[PDB]
C-alpha cells in the first residue's frame, strides 16, 4: 500500500509500504522527519499545542492510496531505534511485546492452579492475622480484607527478565548485539503466532551496531517472519552502503528520499530498461546488475558536491538509473592520469 | 502525681493528676488553655516565636510536687478531641496505635510460616514458564527470575481495613459513636498489652455526641483499662451535666478549674465534713451525696451571674462545698409562697 | 423555612430553619448524624460507596416544606466545629472565607498599580537573563519567557496572618477564645457587605470554649449581623445548660433532638398555654417564664433514667411543656425530710 | 592521551585519544562495545553482578600510556546518542548544562538589584493592604506579613524555557537538527567559559541524521570549541561514508577498528609513505590523497567478503594503506573489456 505523510509546507511524503519496507536517500533530514512523524502518528503521541506549531495547530495525518486517513489505531506499532527500546520491549509493562507475550504463556491450567494455592495462603494469613485484631464491638467489626493476587501482578512484581549463557547470567547490554535482535525476533514469533492483528515495526539506527555479515542473519528471519505472518510489516532505515537489500518481491518497497522522492521499481522491469542504455554489448549479469542496484540507489536522485567513490560499472549504472526517473546528476569520468598503471598495480 | 502547669500570668495550675484524671468547672477559658499546653508539651509540638511569646520566647514547662520538670518524653500521648481523632489511630500508618500494634505480631511463625508456601508457589510458577519460554538463541537463553514476595508488599497491594455489619462495609462515620469509642479502645487494650511504656491519654468533646447512659458503658470500659494496665492514664475534660463520675477511686484525681483550681477529696470525707453541717437530722445517704457530687462539682468555685437551677438538696450540699473549700458563694433561697401547690403538682 | 434530612432507616429528621437556629435536645446521637449529613451535603462530600451504604448507596437528600429538593450549592457553607477550622478560614486558601475577602481588598487601583511595577521587575530580570543565555542559532532561539505575577498568587505564596497585640506577635492559639469568634465573625461582616449570596454557617463544640458571659457577646455579635444582612443563616449546637437563647424572634427555630423531635412555638403563646396550666395563681412573669423555658428545653422529649436536678419552678414547667407535646415524662416530686430546715439554712 | 580499554577476552583496546577523537571501522560490535564501555565508566554507572559478569565480576579499567589507571572521575560526561540526549543536556534540571550555567549567573548584580525593587513593591501591597484590613477585637489586631520573593521562587513558578522562531514556539523536535546541534554546542560554549573542568563528549548516531553539508558546520563548530577550550574532548563515532575528517591536526587521533586496532598518523607522512609505492609517477596532490583517505579509512584493516565499490585511485590508496600496516586485504582488480566505452559514457 501507501503512505502519503503530511508535510509541515510542502506536498506530502510518498511511501510505497510493503511486507518489508526499506527507506534510503541522502536527504537525512527528511527521513528523520518521516520517522518522527510516523512513530507520533501510530505510537500514540499525546500532542501539545507546541507539537502542532509547524502544521497550524492541527494533527497531522497520513493517507493511503485512496487519500482516504490511516487509523493512528490500526497498527500495533513497535519502535526500534536503539537497543534500549528492544530491551524494554522484553520487560513486563504496559503495552511492550513481553505482556502480550507472557501473559498467554502464565494463561495455562498448570500454573492458573499455583495461583490458587498462593490465594488460599493468603486467605490463611487474613485470617491469622484477624484473629490478632479481634477488633469487635456489637454489630461491627474492624478487619483486614484481601484482594486476591493476580498474575499481571505476580508478573508486574515478582518477575524479572535475566540473560544467561549456560546458566551464568549476564546483562542484556553484554548479549551480543545479533543475538539482541534473535531473542526479539522470537518472542515476536511467538506472539504473532497466537494474534491475527497487524503489526508495524520500524527499525532504524541498527545498522551501525552490527557487522554486514550479522545483518544478513537478521535481515533473513524477518523475510521468514513476514512470510509467515501476512499481518506482519517492516520499516527499515538502511545506511548508505553495505545493508539495503534487492530482491524481486522487495523492490518496489524500497523507498529513495533525497532531493526528491520516488520507490524503486520491479528489478526485472529496471533491468531491461538499463540494458537498453547501457554504452556497451557486455551487459552486467542480472546478479550483477542487483548489486549494482544495492550500491547505488541510496544515492539516486541527490545533486551532489562531492562526487561519491564507486566503480566504472556501479557509475555508469548510478547514471542511466537517475535518468530513469529524470534525475539530472550524473558522475563524471574521473580524471586521474596513466589509469591503466593503476588498474595493472591491482591485478 | 501533681501537675503544675504553666501560665502565661498567674501561679502555675495545680492538677492532681490519677490512672483516671478529670477537669471539670466553669473556668472554660482556663480549662481550654490548660489541655492546649498539656497536647503541645506532650505532644511534641515544635514551638515557633509567636507561640512563646506570652512565656518571653521561653519554652513552657510542667513541674511535678517537688518543683521539678515532668519531661516533655515522659508519655506516649494520645488526644482525642473528636471522632477523627479515634479514626487516624486506627489507620496503619507509622505512629498509629493500629501501626505499633501490627508490626508486634504481622513478625510470628502463625503467618510467617504461610510465606514459605506462597514463595514455593512462586518458584513452582517460575519454572513452569521458563519451560514453555523458549527463547535461545547463540548460547544465550530467555528465563524470567521470581523476586521473594515478602510481607509488607503483600499488606500494602493486597490488603485493605474495613468496618463492617455482617460482611457490610460502611464508612467509620457511620459506625454507632459508643462503638467508634469501644473500638478504639479495644486497639488500645491490645497494643498496652505489648508494652509497659507510659501512655497519657486525653479525651475532650465527646460527651455532646453520645448519650449519658452510654458514656457510662465507655467510662466503665476505661476503668477497666486502667485497672488492667498501670502504664495508662485518662484526662477527661466532663460537660457540666451527666457525664463526671465520682467514686472511692477517682474522686481524688477531679479537678475545678473555675474561679479557684481545686482537687476533690476522698468521698467519706467529704461526706462527713459536709454532714457536720448538713441542716437536717437526717441525712441524705453516702449514694445520695455521692450523686449530689456529681451534679454539683462542675458548678463549684463559682461566683455565678446566674444562680443555676438545682434541686433544693442539691442547692444545700453546694453550699457547704463552697464553704469547705472556704468559697465565697452561695445559691440564695429563691422562696415563693405556693411551693405547696407546686409540690403537689408534681404528683 | 424547613429541612427534611435523610435518615437510614426512619421518617426524616425535621428541621425549623431560621436566621439564627439553635439544635438542643438529649439524643446527642441523633444530633451528630443531624449535623454529620448538614455538612457533608452542603460541605461539598464527595461521596463513596462506603460512605452511602446505609442509604443503599443512594446519594441523601434533604427536602423543603414544599417536599422538593434542596439543593446543596444552595449555600456557601462554613463548618466551625473547632478553633482549627476558625483558623483555616482566615488563612487564603481556596474557599475559605478569607480568599473571598482578601481579593476584594487587594484588588485596588492603588494596589494594582505595584503589580505592575513588579511584573515590570520580572520583564527585567528576563530580559537580563536572556541576554547571558544567548541560545540563538539561526531562525530559532532559545530564552526564559515569564508568566507574569497575579496577586492571588502572591496571597498565596508570599503572605501570612499574623495576630498581635500593641504589635507583638501571638499564636493564633493563644488568642483569647472570645476574640477569636469576633475576630471571624468581623471578618464574615466586611465579606457579606460586598454580597448578596446565601450564607450558611455551622457551630458546635464552642460553648465548652468559652464561659456563659463570653457566648453572651458572640450571641449578641450573631443577632447583628442576621439582622444586618438577610442572607446570613446561622445553625448552632448548644449545650444543654447556660447557652441555649430564646426570644421572640427565634423560638420557632430552636429544635429539640430528643426521644422526638418537635421545634418550640412563639414564646407568647407558650407563656399563655402554660399558664392556664399552672398550679398556682401566682404565674411567672413573662421573663422568668423565658428564662424557665431556656433551662428546660434541652431535656423536653426526653424519658429519663435519672431526674435532673432543677428548681420546683422549673420542675412544673418542664412538666407542663411536655404535656403540651404530649410527652408523658414527668419530674416527680422530691422525697426529701425537712425540705423546710433546707429552704431556711438557703435563706 | 592513550586509552587502553579492558576487553572481556581479549588485550585491552588501544585507542588514541586528542581533543576531536574518531573511532571509525568495520567492527561494529568491537566499536559497540567501546562505546558502552566509556558510557559506564566515565558516565557513572552502578555495576551488577550481573553487569560485571564477563569480567569475572571485577570491575573493568581503562588505562594509559603507563600503564596506569584512567581515573573514573577525570571526566564530565555527555553521551550523546540521540536528540533526546541534546534536549536533556538543555533542560534546566540539576546535572545538566543550563542548569550548572544558569547557577553561575542568575546570582549577579545585575539581576540580584532587580529582587531588591520587586521586594519593596511587596511590602508596599501588604501595607497597603494592612490599612484597608480592619479587623481588630479587644487587644488582638489581624494583619498580613509578606514572605520575601526569592529568585529560585521566580525561576520555578513563572518561567518556563521555550524554542522558538520569531516569537513562536515550536517543540524541540522541530528544530532543525543541524540547529539542534548548534544549540547544544552554544550552551556547553556558555558552560565552558566558566569553568577549567575536564569534559569528554561522546556522539554517535548523529550522522544519519544530517546532511554531509550540514555536519561540516557541525565539525567546524566542535573544531572552534576545542580551540577554545583546552578542558573539551569529543570523542565521535563516524558512519562509513561522508562524515569521518582527515586534517593536519586531528589524523592522529582516527582510529580504526576492524579486524585488527590502529590509528593514523601525521598526514604528509602517510602521503610520502604511500607515493613511495604508488603505481604512477603522476601522484595525487595532498589535498586529492587527503580527501581518499577519509573515504578509504573506514574500510581499512579488513578482511571483506564484499568487495567495496571504490573509483581506481582510492582503490590503489587503500591498498597501499593496508600494506602500511601489514594488513593483508587488497581490494582486486575488477577487470572489464569495454572499459574505454564507460568511460566514454561518463562524459
Ligand atoms: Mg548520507
Ligand atoms: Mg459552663
Ligand atoms: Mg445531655
Ligand atoms: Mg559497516
Chains 1, 2, 3, 4 share one sequence.
Not at 506499532?77 to 501473559?103: C, H, N, P, V, W
Not at 503489526?199 to 554486514?212: A, Q
Not at 526485472?268 to 556497451?280: D, G
Not at 540507489?297 to 551532489?304: D, E, N
Amino acid at each position: 500500500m501507501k503512505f502519503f505523510v503530511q508535510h509541515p509546507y510542502k506536498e506530502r511524503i510518498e511511501l510505497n509500504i510493503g511486507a518489508i519496507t526499506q527507506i534510503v536517500g541522502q536527504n537525512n533530514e527528511l527521513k528523520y522527519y518521516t520517522w518522527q512523524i510516523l512513530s507520533w502518528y501510530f505510537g500514540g503521541k499525546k500532542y501539545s499545542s507546541e507539537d502542532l506549531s509547524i502544521f497550524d495547530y492541527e494533527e497531522p495525518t497520513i493517507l493511503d492510496e485512496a487519500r482516504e486517513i490511516v487509523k493512528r489505531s490500526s497498527y500495533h506499532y513497535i519502535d526500534i531505534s536503539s537497543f534500549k527500546d528492544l530491551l524494554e520491549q522484553m520487560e513486563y509493562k504496559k503495552g511492550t511485546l513481553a505482556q502480550g507475550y507472557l501473559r498467554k504463556i502464565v494463561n495455562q491450567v498448570d500454573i492458573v492452579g499455583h495461583l490458587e494455592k498462593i490465594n488460599e495462603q493468603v486467605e490463611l494469613i487474613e485470617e491469622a492475622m484477624n484473629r490478632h485484631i479481634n477488633l469487635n464491638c456489637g454489630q461491627v467489626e474492624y478487619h483486614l480484607e484481601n484482594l486476591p493476587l493476580t498474575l499481571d501482578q505476580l508478573l508486574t512484581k515478582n518477575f524479572s527478565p535475566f540473560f544467561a549463557i549456560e546458566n551464568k547470567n549476564l546483562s542484556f547490554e553484554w548479549v551480543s548485539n545479533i543475538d539482541k535482535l534473535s531473542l526479539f525476533l522470537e518472542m515476536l514469533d511467538h506472539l504473532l503466532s497466537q494474534t491475527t492483528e497487524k503489526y508495524l515495526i520500524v527499525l532504524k539506527n541498527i545498522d551501525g551496531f552490527i557487522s554486514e555479515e550479522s545483518y544478513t542473519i537478521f535481515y533473513r528471519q524477518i523475510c521468514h517472519l513476514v512470510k509467515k505472518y501476512p499481518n506482519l510489516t517492516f520499516i527499515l532505515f538502511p545506511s548508505d552502503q553495505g545493508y539495503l537489500k534487492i530482491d524481486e518481491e522487495n523492490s518496489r518497497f524500497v523507498n529513495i528520499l533525497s532531493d526528491q522522492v520516488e520507490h524503486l521499481y520491479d528489478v526485472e522491469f529496471m533491468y531491461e530498461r538499463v540494458m537498453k542504455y547501457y554504452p556497451s554489448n557486455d551487459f552486467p549479469t542480472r546478479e550483477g546488475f542487483r548489486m549494482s542496484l544495492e550500491t547505488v540507489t541510496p544515492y539516486l536522485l541527490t545533486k551532489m558536491l562531492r562526487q561519491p567513490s564507486l566503480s566504472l560499472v556501479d557509475s555508469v549504472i548510478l547514471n542511466i538509473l537517475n535518468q530513469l526517473f529524470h534525475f539530472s546528476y550524473r558522475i563524471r569520468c574521473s580524471q586521474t592520469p596513466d589509469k591503466e598503471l593503476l588498474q595493472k598495480f591491482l591485478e
